[PDB]
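Hi D.,

Good news: the full-assembly prediction came through. Inputs first.
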Amino acid sequence: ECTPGQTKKQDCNTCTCTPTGIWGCTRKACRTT
Amino acid sequence: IVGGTSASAGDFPFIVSISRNGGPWCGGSLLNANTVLTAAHCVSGYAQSGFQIRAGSLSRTSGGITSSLSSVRVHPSYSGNNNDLAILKLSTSIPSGGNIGYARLAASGSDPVAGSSATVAGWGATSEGGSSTPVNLLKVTVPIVSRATCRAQYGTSAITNQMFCAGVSSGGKDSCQGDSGGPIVDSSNTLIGAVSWGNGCARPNYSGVYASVGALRSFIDTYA
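Then the structure:
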């Protein structure tokens, strides 16, 4: 549950808050953790 | 890859793994001796020198043939998640033959038909949020989800005509983090897309989203 249009990062992937109120995130494998 | 199984030697002659700074990162598709097609987000904003590619191996750590990058071409209109393809010119030319071949491409302006079958492959996590990173390639077969349905899951503006989706209503089968850029193909092994984005992985009523080779054929032919 997020406000549509907001952005965040989960590690190295960018996430976008879509119109349906959920996070769409890219699918890279993030290395340096 | 979630809900899939070990891929076999020769199932995807053209698939490559792409490391960044010596770690796993994305997959790709060899189009010719010096060209790899991956997702724009795998390479955009980053130093081209960090990237190595591996072709001709089920393993992401050994075997096959490797190459660093000579240049990178991001789609001119890559925006948000849309037009999410990049062309990578390779520093080492990788001939076809033996375990490697080149990808044939979905027809210009084609669009994956809802309900039809497609298979995606990669070295990504096997569960949503999983600490897993497979050494040997994985693969899953999933149905195409109509754009109208995907637009219902994500929102009309979130899903464009340069994207298409795949997944099963009740979840269970998907690409996931680490599969980005990697091939999804039809049953002729035609490259119809590259892994791009999604809400989690393999969730019920949340499809995997793919950059569409058919919809973006112009870009590819120009820079390949």
